[PDB]
Amino acid sequence: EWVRKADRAAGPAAVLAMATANPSNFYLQSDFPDFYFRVTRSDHMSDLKEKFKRICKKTTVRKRHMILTEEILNKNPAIADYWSPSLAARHDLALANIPQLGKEAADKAIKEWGQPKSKITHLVFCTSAGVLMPGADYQLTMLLGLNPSISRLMLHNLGCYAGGTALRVAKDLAENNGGARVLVVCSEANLLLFRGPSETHIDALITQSLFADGAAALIVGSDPDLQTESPLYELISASQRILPESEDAIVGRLTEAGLVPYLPKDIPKLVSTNIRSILEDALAPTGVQDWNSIFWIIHPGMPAILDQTEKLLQLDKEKLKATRHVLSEFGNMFSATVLFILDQLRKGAVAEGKSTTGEGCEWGVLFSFGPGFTVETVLLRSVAT
Amino acid sequence: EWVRKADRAAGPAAVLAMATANPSNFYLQSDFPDFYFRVTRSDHMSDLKEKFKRICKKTTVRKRHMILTEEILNKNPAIADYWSPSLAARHDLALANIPQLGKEAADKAIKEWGQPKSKITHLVFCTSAGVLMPGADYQLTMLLGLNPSISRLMLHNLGCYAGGTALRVAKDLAENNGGARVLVVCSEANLLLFRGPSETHIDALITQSLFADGAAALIVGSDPDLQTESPLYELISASQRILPESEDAIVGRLTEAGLVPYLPKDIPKLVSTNIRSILEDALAPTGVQDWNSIFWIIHPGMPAILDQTEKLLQLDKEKLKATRHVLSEFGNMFSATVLFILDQLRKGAVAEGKSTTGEGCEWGVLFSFGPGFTVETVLLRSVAT
């Protein structure tokens, strides 16, 4: 059967451009335990400091960009405490930083795209760094001078899987509207999660060792004008799933003192149980049986999950190379991390000179996760260089 | 030109079912000034009490359903104060009430729809009553036993226009995925906005006179199986717009003490300036020139906007009848209000026995608004009874 094309697009949604951005201020992981326990007026917790040093080393992270400088933490002491009233201050910082960080990634992705920004018809904006009314989607539209009639989808506090959610949303936006060009932006920061240590809570210390700040921006569109636009990936399928027996695995309570996490269940064992059949379902219409015949993007929120998954699928160590790079160089930047990894993968493919944007392979899987327990899964097709 | 139907849907998204729900506990508007100033330990502000009485009367509201009982306000005194740390308590109440309220509307819309809930493939969930991780979208999926692989879009704290946003999102979900059935749920409550009075702030007293609690649920799908499903409306176009010269018209700061509004600009004059050309743009592909040849749903967040708009377009008073009913009987239920009004309009058409679900008229416009200043506009086509 056939249908009249009408106002709709012919082909699959394509990633047409991608860039990233980070705050200027970063911290090397090897200096962070000293910086963290100094500025949170907490050097006295000497045994906890030792525990944190051990955790920070095992995160295999090297640096993390962070809006929060010593000076800003000085001008907002409540944020540095473990649990003091501080939501308005965190959100004042989100308003001064999150749309601006998004605009820096967006400007670079639009520059690569090479088209006028009045051709952008949709914005998808994800952040867990501050609930704003009007949203960071609004602030970015103003800072960028986008059409006032852009169709915006503002996604607050989905958590870490929202990079997948952004692609899943952009897919239906682009395919159902002919000509539609979708700016996708995930702009993340620890502004809600950052706090001092307490011996009573260690599910808060692990969070201080990993989360960092960054924004990714993409252009997503179908029916590319192949003489002005160069597709980078195709978004072929995009699905969401609640994993069985995962109730309250990841919970985030937003309080007077900001965002407070609670991690009772074994996240690795949950992923390890379920990842294979999820990915088998994603790969089903490709006829790919070899796990190392596809490129890989896994949200790196827990390093152990990468290792255990690498082992289970007996992946070549080179597969998770883009993923492990972003982890080491940037940390967990919430929903943005998987889009950084997509970008590093595209860049490492062109640098090392391989046949496809997907490292020579044809198909690829994007796998992200967070509260639910929720998994987002995207099936990607590379393009030839 | 034509395209292969493939995995996509042939025709426009249709509203196939709708129901509403409210908390059991309600308050008549004529008793509210006494109840409000009593339970907020505030009877001493006698002049403010008089001012509130005047505001409450001019809201033309008759009753409002509210989760917040005297007893619950007794068990959470910080919520009753003007500005005390209370976010965690408000959010504990959101978790116990907002997904459940959504489930009551959903159960009734699914019952009308007449299909098994395993046919539901997408959930769009809007709320400004509490940021939850995982979201009310998750909690509802569990309470309803929906497929764990449903595609969910959780929209926190868009504010009052999100009933339009929900329809705009559901439209592209249904049209781009053949067979897709989209549960749409807006579940709203004043849990973040409720607070005591202060003489220093009157842009907070007006908010206490209008906002109320309620949930609406719809089934949205394209390609209806016309022997098991009876379409109610078609979603023909859906657009969003930032109005010019509207920077900071409506701002909502989420703080330690909950959601605090700020309303510096003249909202009526902004709508009055712009509504005509927006609606003319929506109606453009219909060839309708008569304003009273179409049915009407206007978000009733400010009663004066209804009157001034009724006058400007010289509308027959009968046009905004469904809209004014919901206002009087339920108040401003945030994003849910325009879906209540859609439902009351459908019900008033079948009750008074008219030719179309749109009161005999063929086309209709849905107009909602909130922070930005943002306007959502949906073009609806009725169906014959």
The reply to whether A70 and A185 lie within a common domain is yes
The reply to whether A121 and A39 lie within a common domain is yes
3-class secondary structure for A201-244?
A: ECCCHHHHCCECCEEEEEEEECCCCCCCCCCCEEEEEEEEEECC
Query: What 3-state DSSP class applies to A302?
Result: coil
The reply to whether A327 and A365 lie within a common domain is yes
* Residue A290 counted as domain residue: yes
Q: Could you write out the DSSP letters of every residue in A80-141?
A: HSSS-S-HHHHHHHHHHHHHHHHHHHHHHHHHHHTS-GGG--EEEEEESS--EES-HHHHHH
How far apart CA A61 and CA A329 sit, in angstroms, is 7
Pick the last residue of a domain from B221, B249, B266: B221
Pick the last residue of a domain from B221, B252, B284: B221
CB contact at 8 A, A261 and A203? yes
Buried residues in A88-113 as b, exposed as e (16+ CB within 10 A)? bbbbebbeebbbbbbbbbbbbbbeeb
The reply to whether A353 and A247 lie within a common domain is yes
Query: What 3-state DSSP class applies to B128?
Result: coil
Q: CA torsion sign, B310 to B315 to B321 to B323? A: negative
The reply to whether A69 and A148 lie within a common domain is yes
In the chain, the amino acid numbered B195 is: R
Category of B363 on φ-ψ map: left (φ > 0), alpha (ψ -120 to 50) or beta = beta
In the chain, the amino acid numbered A87 is: L
CA A139-A143-A144 angle, 5° bins: 115
The reply to whether A164 and A268 lie within a common domain is no
Could you tell me which chain A residue has the CA closest to the CA of B141? A242
Q: Which of A139, A175, A256 would you mutate first to test chain B, the one with the most B CBs within 10 A?
A: A256
Q: Where are the alpha helices (DSSP H) in chain A?
A: 32-39, 46-58, 70-74, 77-80, 87-113, 136-144, 162-175, 205-208, 267-283, 303-312, 321-330, 337-351
β-pairing, A214-221 vs A181-188, is: antiparallel
Residues of chain B in contact with residue A4, where contact means CB-CB under 8 angstroms, are 1-2
Residue contact A87–B372, C-beta within 8 A = no
* Residue B274 counted as domain residue: yes
CB contact at 8 A, A43 and A49? yes
Closest CB to A87: pick one of B134, B152, B256: B256
Buried residues in B44-61 as b, exposed as e (16+ CB within 10 A)? ebeebbebbbebbeebeb
Count of A–B CB contacts within 8 Å? 166
Give the total residue count for chain A: 385
The reply to whether A59 and A115 lie within a common domain is yes
How far apart CA A147 and CA B13 sit, in angstroms, is 26
Return the number of other C-beta atoms located less than 10 Å from residue A245's C-beta.
10
The reply to whether A135 and A213 lie within a common domain is yes
CB contact at 8 A, A368 and A338? yes
Residues of chain A in contact with residue B157, where contact means CB-CB under 8 angstroms, are 131, 133, 135, 156
The reply to whether A56 and A194 lie within a common domain is yes
Return the number of other C-beta atoms located less than 10 Å from residue A273's C-beta.
15
How many CA within 13 A on the CB side of residue A48?
21
- Minimal Cα–Cα distance from B2 to chain A, Å? 5
How far apart CA A245 and CA A281 sit, in angstroms, is 20
Closest CB to B131: pick one of A154, A254, A256: A254
H helix or E strand, kind and range, residue B245: none
Instruction: List the domain range (segments joined by +) for residue B256.
Output: 233-382
Q: CA torsion sign, A362 to A356 to A297 to A120? A: negative
Read off the CATH number of the domain in which B287 is found: 3.40.47.10
* Residue B7 counted as domain residue: no
Q: Is B264 on the interface with A (CB under 8 A)?
A: no
Angstrom CA distances, A11 to A183, A374, B96, B221, stand at: 18, 28, 44, 22
Q: Could you write out the DSSP letters of every residue in B201-243?
A: BSTTHHHHTTB--EEEEEEEESS--TTT----EEEEEEEEEEP
Return the number of other C-beta atoms located less than 10 Å from residue A195's C-beta.
26
Residues of chain B in contact with residue A85, where contact means CB-CB under 8 angstroms, are 85, 256
β-pairing, B233-242 vs B14-21, is: antiparallel
CB contact at 8 A, B5 and A2? yes
How far apart CA A243 and CA A212 sit, in angstroms, is 26
Pick the last residue of a domain from B191, B221, B251: B221
The reply to whether A160 and A30 lie within a common domain is yes
B113 is written with which tokens?
Answer: 């729809």
Residue B56 among the catalytic residues: no
**How much is the CA Rg of chain B, to the nearest whole Å?**
20
Query: What 3-state DSSP class applies to A276?
Result: helix
| Total tally of structural domains belonging to chain B | 2
* Residue B314 counted as domain residue: yes
CB contact at 8 A, A76 and A34? no
A375 contact partners, CB below 8 Å, separation of at least 6? A161, A240, A241, A243, A271, A274, A278, A367, A368, A369
Query: What 3-state DSSP class applies to A184?
Result: strand
Instruction: Report the candidate in B356, B363, B240, B237 with the shortest Cα–Cα distance to residue B297.
Output: B363
The reply to whether B253 and B199 lie within a common domain is no
The reply to whether B173 and B307 lie within a common domain is no
β-pairing, B258-262 vs B151-156, is: unpaired
How far apart CA B99 and CA B117 sit, in angstroms, is 17
B-contacting residues in A 109-138 (Cβ below 8 Å): 131-135, 138
